[PDB]
Design an enzyme around this catalytic site. Structure first.
Site, short mmCIF file in Angstrom:
data_model
loop_
_atom_site.label_atom_id
_atom_site.label_comp_id
_atom_site.label_asym_id
_atom_site.label_seq_id
_atom_site.Cartn_x
_atom_site.Cartn_y
_atom_site.Cartn_z
N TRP A 130 44.79 44.40 32.40
CA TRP A 130 44.90 44.99 33.71
C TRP A 130 45.34 43.82 34.59
CZ3 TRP A 130 40.59 45.17 37.67
CH2 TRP A 130 40.94 46.02 38.74
N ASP A 211 34.40 44.58 30.32
CA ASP A 211 34.90 45.36 31.43
C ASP A 211 34.91 46.76 30.91
OD1 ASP A 211 36.12 46.61 33.52
OD2 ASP A 211 37.94 45.42 33.47
N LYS A 246 37.20 56.66 37.17
CA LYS A 246 37.95 57.46 36.23
C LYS A 246 37.16 58.53 35.51
CE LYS A 246 40.62 53.33 36.61
NZ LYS A 246 40.51 51.87 36.23
#
Ligand SMILES: *Cc1c(COP(=O)(O)O)cnc(C)c1O
Ligand SMILES: *Cc1c(COP(=O)(O)O)cnc(C)c1O
Lengths: 396, 396
Positions: A130, A211, A246
């Protein structure tokens, strides 16, 4: 004093949206988004969160400050979500969790905490990763390095090359792992490779930083956590940043947690206090709304059941679409074998189109992807599925 | 790696709460809080925000990401709230505003932005000031200095001593001013002194940083802004951090904005982009809930009218209580003349009790104040008013 200031460089992801919201071609398709979309092209509010929000509207009597660490309930459910119910870690009081503004806020908080209270100077992030990972780390003062991950040729995880790049990583170095659904590629280590990566980390002295941004999207809520739990079992220390943006469709409410684990109670506590001081000099305390919504859902058998199903639908839609994608190609021309798209997890994956192939897609055909050839699968619908593959096959 | 970590020092304000939530004395009184309380001892949700929240519950169709700068509406109302309707600054497109997580998040954002894109090395904050100001600035890497403010003897603003301490302040230095209701003392510069402070700032080259945390609590929404507007008129540059936590009773939703003004459009823009990049590496984007509530209220004639009245009540309650306080003393003994409490603005003020007088209050009598002798006036009710002054007079 601001006359010398340099234009900040555009984000092409955040900078990609615009030309979409400016193009005119009827067929227009946006596969460069970062959020989920249902079969109709919308990013709906879950039914479960709408229910939790009515509850709040009715039962809230004050909007007074939360503690610096946020809502206790929220903290507990998170720990249980991450480590599991009868976890040794939870029972031993080895983990302290801070409600944070988004998975991003969690990353920065770990960053400022690590930056100022430890002797950490480097953080290794997977190769394609990311993009915002680096910026969060640099701004804390830490240096970001890159370990190998993705097999450009096989569209696989190069296990060796990965390890080969992690021997240059010294003792007190922080290694960053994506718990599930690798953000750019969708390639996840198997359980044996997570166990192997865990062991190497123990011997070598690395500090894991997980993460978790898509818990529930690869296989499930529990399975998606086995890697993280493989490390938690042998490590005395580890940090984990999770996001509920999300999996609860709570994008703009900034819901995420930053979990810290030490060798024992007394230590996680002492260390937690410094983490609190980091938060305290950042935003002072966390936004109650989106997190109240998550504690309420997770702690209500009724609502939680509904949410699980909503998660499962989302997950199943993406799986329906990866498969339909790798098929429509096979029918509409498709030179190459895209069979790799299948069983790559999450909303993304690299198409494998060259940067020039993406441009041509976006310029002639009106299909919008990130220059890295990364496509959001959840932006595919049965309806747009056909023009989409037809314009891809028209570029190879 | 966390075994070396040092206990973070308690906050005694945030650390003061505990012993209150542990003491037993029936008479127990907490005047060390930072939030407002009505005549019954509660921190209620405004009726106006409850109405705006029902609206949202009904009209929201998505919880997708806000821009990095937040809600445009919110940004505009803020600018208008701060600078005024037909402002030259707004009309000239000289201001860009970022929705931020709380007035605190705004401060840090200005801090990281200033820290990395300008040649600023120092920030001057009033002498007694909100303690957290320093920590926000240090964590950015900036150095904090202190200018004189409060007349220990006269319970006034030492205008000279203030200026005398501001000549050691060089050109590109950031000076921080509290727009209204000075946080610890309640002493505010008059309009002539703000005009004078404005002029000195122009000649000397300082970059003003306004901290607006109580707009509406001293005299009104417009009056409370005349100082800030006196500077805005002669300065080409200035920054302003505002919070909507105390004036909307939205404490835990983290609502605040960070406003940036430059010489012209092209500049505020270039500079704004770097500010966006700072936010982006911090929390990525702002929490929509509390800010949606504020844009909705402020942009609805009906709801805004109700809110104004709710603000006015709060403000009037504190004014009713400062007066009742300075009187009950005069009746119950009171050695000293506390007439100064009257017309000191906001929820606070220094009682002027010695640190040892506070301890005795809290230990024998069960009255809880901050060691600096700072008391929250909004924590006084007609009901507890009497035991309160009786236990103060019992210590001088
Ligand atoms: C989306 C995402 C985040 C940021 O999450 P927010 O919750 O929006 O802050 C962090 N990490 C990864 C890998 C992400 O995909
Ligand atoms: C309360 C306060 C803030 C912090 O505001 P939040 O909105 O809670 O972040 C900042 N500055 C001053 C002077 C305050 O009183």
């Amino acid at each position: 004093m601001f006359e010398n200031i340099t234009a900040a460089p555009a984000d092409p992801i955040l900078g990609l949206a615009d030309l979409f919201r400016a193009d005119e071609r009827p067929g227009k398709i946006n596969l460069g988004i970062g959020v989920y979309k249902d079969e109709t092209g919308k990013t709906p509010v879950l039914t479960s969160v709408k229910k939790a929000e009515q509850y709040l509207l009715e039962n809230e009597t004050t909007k007074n400050y939360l503690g610096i660490d946020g809502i206790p309930e929220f903290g507990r459910c998170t720990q249980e979500l991450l480590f599991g119910k009868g976890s040794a870690l939870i029972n031993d009081k080895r983990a302290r969790t801070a409600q944070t503004p988004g998975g991003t806020g969690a990353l920065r908080v770990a960053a400022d905490f690590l930056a100022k209270n430890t002797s950490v100077k480097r953080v290794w992030v997977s190769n394609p990763s990311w993009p915002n990972h680096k910026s969060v780390f640099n701004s804390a003062g830490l240096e970001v390095r890159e370990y190998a991950y993705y097999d450009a040729e096989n569209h696989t995880l190069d296990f060796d090359a990965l390890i080969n790049s992690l021997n240059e990583a010294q003792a007190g170095d922080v290694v960053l792992f994506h718990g599930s659904c690798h953000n750019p590629t969708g390639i996840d280590p198997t359980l044996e490779q997570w166990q192997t990566l865990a062991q190497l980390s123990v011997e070598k002295g690395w500090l894991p930083l997980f993460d978790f941004a898509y818990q529930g999207f690869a296989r499930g809520l529990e399975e998606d956590a086995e890697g993280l739990r493989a490390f938690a079992a042998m490590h005395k220390e580890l940090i984990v940043a999770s996001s509920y943006s999300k999996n609860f469709g709570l994008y703009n409410e900034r819901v995420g947690a930053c979990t810290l684990v030490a060798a024992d109670s007394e230590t996680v506590d002492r260390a937690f206090s410094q983490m609190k001081a980091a938060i305290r000099a950042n935003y002072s305390n966390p936004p109650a709304h989106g997190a109240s919504v998550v504690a309420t859902i997770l702690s209500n058998d009724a609502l939680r059941a509904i949410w699980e199903q909503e998660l499962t639908d989302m997950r199943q839609r993406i799986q329906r679409m990866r498969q339909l994608f790798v098929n429509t190609l096979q029918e509409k021309g498709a030179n190459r074998d895209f069979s790799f798209i299948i069983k790559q997890n999450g909303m993304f994956s690299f198409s494998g189109l060259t940067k020039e192939q993406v441009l041509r897609l976006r310029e002639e055909f009106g299909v919008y992807a990130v220059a890295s050839g990364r496509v959001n699968v959840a932006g595919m619908t049965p309806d747009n599925m056909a023009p989409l593959c037809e314009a891809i096959v028209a570029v190879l």
